[model samples]
Every structure is written in C-alpha cells, then in structure tokens.
Target: KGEELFTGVVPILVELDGDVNGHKFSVRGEGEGDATNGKLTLKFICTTGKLPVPWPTLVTTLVQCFSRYPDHMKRHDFFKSAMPEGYVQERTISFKDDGTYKTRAEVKFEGDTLVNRIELKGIDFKEXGNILGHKLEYNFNSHXVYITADKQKNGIKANFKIRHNVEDGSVQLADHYQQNTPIGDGPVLLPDNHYLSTQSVLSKDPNEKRDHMVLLEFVTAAGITH
Candidate 1:
C-alpha cells in the first residue's frame, strides 16, 4: 500500500439551516465525489423549499454557508438534523454577528463552482415532509449514485435513467424542464429495520410520509483512471 492513490466513490452531504427573509430555510442534498480529496467534481444535487429571495442571493448564501460545513462530508454517518428530538445534537456555524446578512452567508474560502447552484433540482413548499426517501449507490469499482425526491409521478412507480457520462471528473446531467429529455424516477421505501446510510434524507419521524424513493442507477460507459 505504498504511495497509492485509490480513486473511488465518496458520499457527500451539505446542509444549511438559517432564517432567510423571515422564512426558516433549510437546504440539504446527497451527492457523490472523489475519495482522494472528497472533491465534488463528479456529481451533486440538492433539494430545498421555495427560495425566499432571488435565486442569485440564495445561491451565494448557499455557497458561503456550505464551505463552512466541510466536516459534514468527512464521515458517512447519520447527520445532525435527522436525529430524533431528544437525541438531537447540533453543529454550530458561528458568524461574527455584525447584524448583517453578509456575515450570516459569508464564505470561509475562495473559488466557486457552477455545479453548486445548478444542481438544486427539487423545490418543495412543505419543508418538514419534503425529503420522502434518500440513498447512495457506491461501489469498489468507482461507480457512485446519489438521489433525493419530494413527490411521486401520479402515484405510480417508475424508473428513470440518469445518464452518467464522466469526462475527466464531471458527471453531466440534462436539465429537468427540456421537453424531450425527461428526468423521471420514483422512490423505493427503505425497510422498517433498514440502517440509514446517507444524510440526504432529513426526517426521522416514523409518522412522516417517507415513500417515493428515487434511484440513480450506475453503469460503466467508458474507461477512465486516476
């Protein structure tokens, strides 16, 4: 194992909880990255409630706040907000508190990527009941998949093909609105005794409606190496 660089699928979750424009905003997502440095250069997608402000402002806030929670992507364990009431713990993002919006959404580092904003596919009005189900598909062969969902397509189960074309280190996906290419998929309920793996799913309540799981099937297309 001397001087080895093993490039594999790494699961990543980034969350932000703050009051934006008199609305309690919480944005979370599940995505895949490179294991070496955990770079989200491959694929990432997030879901959140309707934007309280314009998309640009929210996008900047999302990037700034996300850069601070790099530790959340370090481990593949159960996340904070997902824990039960009494068992809940928290990670504090302490701002300097200058009473300015800039302080709250300020970034910890430089350099920004377009993937962070465009990957926000799902927008839900019901925040508490939004994330129905979540899962990550990672394997030893470097194939990775991450998915999140808010609703079912007319209450029928279906499979959607997420085309994974990796050129260099990016996973290219088509937009959801374009007429021809459809972003169609449904969720599969995790078993009652299933062990939760990723932080993509938010609610921990048994009473919550958590059906309609999404899927991201991974298949080898071409060959690439680290």
Candidate 2:
C-alpha cells in the first residue's frame, strides 16, 4: 500500500469575478496541503462548463501564484506562466478521490494562448457510464462537478466545474460533464476558510499537486532575510 501522503489540503485562496459569454462569472477557492507538505489551498465557486474547458488555467494561475518552495530559496517556478492579458485562460479541471495528495492538473501554451487541464481522479460523483441528463444537469453543469476515486482508497477528493466557449464549437460542456445528476455523492463547496502561519515539509507522494496543495504563508516566512 502507498503511504498516506496528506491529511488535509488548503490551497491558496483565489477569487475571480468576470464576464463569460457576456455573463457574470465568479470563482472562489482556498484549501491546504497534507499534514506534512503541499503548496496552496484551492477554494472555489464558478459558472458552468465541462472538465476540459475553463478550470485548468485558473487553477494553474494559482499554481503560478504559489509555486515556490522554501528550500529552493523560493526561486522555483512552474514551466508555464499565467495567460496573456485580455485572453481568458481556458481550463479543464477534474478530481481524483484521494484529492489531497493524488490530485493532478496540467497547463500549456499554444503561443499567446494558454490551455489548462485538471484531472479529478479521486474525489467523487458523475461519470460517462452513469445515468443520463435532466434539469439536474443544469444545476451541476452550471455550478459544479464532484468526483472521487474508490472508497477506502487514499487519493484526491476535490471537485469543481468549468465553463466552455460556445464559439469554440466544442460540444457544449454540459454534455461532457453530465446528462443527469449523479446517483453518488461528492464533496460540497468549502463552507469556511481559516488561516495561520505554516511550516514546510516533504510528503510521501511528492509532486506538483502535493506541492501546490501547501500554503504559501510558510514559503515566504521560511525565506531567510539577506
């Protein structure tokens, strides 16, 4: 069995409100790393779309915001920088049931354009093989997507939704996200956000997801004054 990598994850708090397809869109997320190590907590609320459209870039932006490690002298960096100004960063975010440590996401650049993708392998909820669509689709597709791995398994467990651009001609996000509300249960939005100073450490499963889950308060605090 794999060693438990984290007990909890509190990503760096993120807040965004803007226009999507010329409508109001906003997102808020904050959470932390494992009991041992991580980077930033992610707390969120956003308008609708499927997994491969909107969530990645935003999450990656937060990654860029909080990517430094204390021992690296806080001089470290993620390969892709944030998106260009005036261009909405398109992202696709998913959840794996053992989210705290098992969570994974990726970002890329096709010239000035940015593409981001998040895979939720551990969390819980809807899938392609499950029941089909209804108004429940409206509720979740327009709001969130909850996903998980297997019970009794240690993996990622964070869930969120993304919004896509109709102009792109990609299938509307709702179809990809779900046709009906899921029969299973998934995590709820963060009901609260609290903070304090932190200490940095390594994890059993050390990687970007685990690193990003840690809070930045410690990284800055860990920097030795020159």
Candidate 3:
C-alpha cells in the first residue's frame, strides 16, 4: 500500500458525444484543484478506437435490454439512480504506457430526490507484470433513489470495479510472457448490464488507409448529491 501523497477537492465538468464522421465517441471535460493539500482535481476525457459500442438502441435503451440476471439488473438500477447531476459519461480513453489504474465513485440522496453530489478517487502505474502497476483500485458509495423508469422507482446499494492498462499501447515480448499466469482483465465497464457498441469508419482519402480505425464509447451515470 502507498501512503496518501495528496488530498484536496476540485470542481469538474465533462461532456461526451458520438462522432458520425470518425465512428467514435469523444469526451471533453475540465476541472480545477482546490488550494488545500496542494491537490487539484482536473477533468480528463478522450475518445479512442480501441473499445467500440456495437448496438444502436444500447445508448438510448433501458436496463432490461442487456440485463436479465437479477444481480445485474440490481446493479444497473443502483448506478442509474446514483448518477450525479451534470456528471458526464466516458466515451473513450488513450493510455500512454504499460500501467494500470483503479477508480472509485460515490453519491448521496435524500428519500427519492436526487441531490447533485459525487466523489471519486483513482491511482495509476507503469508496468504490466509488476504487482504495484496492477494494484490501483477504487470504490463508489452513495445514497440516492434508484430510478427504473422516467417516473418509476427502484433503489439499491451501488458498487463496481474499473481497471486500466497503462501498457495497452505496448507490443508483447517473449521475456514478458507468463505461461500459466492469470491474464490481467484491463478494465471493467460497470453496471454489468450493458455492453459496448462500436463502429469503424475507413478514410476515403488515398493516404488514409493506414489511419483507418474503429471507435468505442461507454455510458453510465453515478447518482446526484447536493
């Protein structure tokens, strides 16, 4: 375990949207760190071709579509109602090196009303085979009314896991291989009820063949807190 090096609060804003031309979803957000603890929390959002969403209705549809398992549906409702107001969903991300990250989020509510409030924490690393690099973890805890329908109701405790590979951009080498070891599951897209939808668009320009790629997007909300 690492000692806490920084502690502070930051204001954040994020936006995510799909791009038809690039066949990808793009995200943009900004944040500022507070003076206390010399810690500033800034917003970070990006779009990538790595993970793509495959269905259309998946974005605008409800939990029932992909979640038939009871536990899955329960988690789905928990996240849907826990999303904070003005909280932005993630569409994509670009990893610079071989590392891993863990994130935790939380929300609070009073009765059935959604108060806008949220909290998040995360860590990152640099090598794939290193335990320190793979140990980043996070948690989300919140109190809010779980929303099932636009006007319907459902509520439950919410929690999930997210992992990121810092070395996702690297090419594997023979020395880095483990024959019977566990393969790291890069990241866990939460809610467990939804799947990603993706699309690929090829550039028509003669010189664009090498640049051709696909786009991926993930959408989910954590409850509101005020």
Candidate 4:
C-alpha cells in the first residue's frame, strides 16, 4: 500500500506494506529530533497493522535464523554469554554493499536495554580539522561507548545518549552528524527505516550549548497517517 509521510515541512511518499511470512503489513508516521539547552530529544511514532510478538520468542527466532552463519552465531553467542545475571544484550544488525555486516550491541546492566549511549563519527568525510566519519567520543562524564556505520567516511553518524536522574529514571538523546553543505539530502536516518532527505539546521551557539530540531511526518493508506 502507498503511504504519505510528513517531516512537518515536506510530505514523503512511502511504501507502507511490507511482506513477511506471505503476509502484508503497513506502517506510517514521523520521527522527531530536538536539541535544546543541553538536552536532546528523539521520538518515533508509527502504526503497525500487526501486533508485536513476545520478546523471548523473537530472540529465539533470531538465534535460529543466524544459526546458519556459524561465525556470526559464535559472535552473537559470545556477547550473549558475557551478559551478567539478570542483564541482557540488545543488538542492531545492518548490511553494507561491500558484503560486510555491522553489528551494534548494547549491554544493559538493567532490564531495559535502551539505557546505553551511542556516538558515531567519521575520519575523512569532512575537512581535515572537522569531525570526519566514525570517530570515538566521550561525554563529559567519561562513559565509554563505540560507534559504527556502513560507509566509513560518507555515512550517517548518530549519537544515542542516556542520562539517569535522581527523580526521573532516565533521559535519552540521539544526535545525528552530517555535512553542512547544500545537498538536498544529508546523512540522517529516521526511525521508520528512512533517511532525512534534507537538512535545514546545524551548529551550536558558541556562547552556550545549542540545540537543534528537525520536524518529520508521514501518512499511510489507513488515513492521513500522521
């Protein structure tokens, strides 16, 4: 089915219905990014025609699916085996044109796996002095994390930060890095498996930390889908 997407500034044409198990499912919506006053926000909303399965079952199925790749399975199992009692590992797997696979894993001490942070940079994508591609970075607090991407120099860079508060459990930030050139589309990924087609803002205020926000929206066959 056809779907319409919004970025609050533009409408994007999207194919909502995806095939799996000979069944078709549709999803449509928007992903948001906002950075303000030393804080960042990212929110994803989409409508799925199918209900989510149990996490345990999903994990079991994934393990079975990767069984054919003994090397991959070994790596997966190694991480899984390394988890401390009551802790869990969450992962994201993506493929590159060069036949290399990129796996991002976050080990959460708590039950919730999303508490970790992610920072991605490049080595040669930009000017000599500027942040290029996937380089290592650390927050002021010195928490350690690694970043990965498909393209070494010209791919999207995303940073996912999590903060814990005395009153609030946690807060998160997903910062995206890309060239500030005049390209119609920059290297930013949206939550619904799409990339940002264009970018309008960058840079922080020198006097104080700056925050950036980009609006995104989408519509689906079910309705005006935002």
Better structure of 2 and 4 per TM-score? 2
Pick by lDDT: 3 or 4, better one: 3
lDDT of 2 by residue, 116-221 (tens): 3333322223332111111112111123223232223312132334333233333233211211111123321111111112323212224333212222223222
Give the top-scoring candidate (TM-score): 2
The top-ranked prediction according to lDDT is: 2
Model 2 residue 151 lDDT? 25
Give residue 76's lDDT in candidate 2 (0 to 100).
Answer: 19
CA displacement after TM-score superposition, residue 55 of candidate 4 (Å): 9.5
User: Model 3 over residues 43-146: C-alpha lDDT tens digits?
Assistant: 22333432222221111110111111233233433232323221222112212343222221122122322222211111242333422333221211111212
Q: All models: lDDT?
A: 0.24, 0.28, 0.24, 0.20
Models sorted by lDDT, best on top: 2, 3, 1, 4
Window of ten residues with lowest summed lDDT in model 2: 131-140
Residue-wise C-alpha lDDT for candidate 4, range 1-226, written one tens digit per residue: 0001111222111112223223333333222212111112222112353312111111100110001112212222221232222112232221111111112222222331212222111111222211111121211121212223323432223332222111123222222221111112333221211221111112222453212212221211110123
**RMSDs, each prediction?**
20.1, 18.4, 18.5, 21.9
| Model 2 whole-model lDDT (C-alpha atoms) | 0.28
Q: Note the residue pairs that clash in candidate 1.
A: 187-212, 187-213, 187-214, 188-213
Q: Estimate each model's TM-score.
A: 0.24, 0.25, 0.22, 0.21
Minimum summed lDDT over a 10-residue window in model 4 is located at 57-66
The 10-residue segment with the lowest total lDDT in model 1:
174-183
True lDDT of residue 222, candidate 2: 31
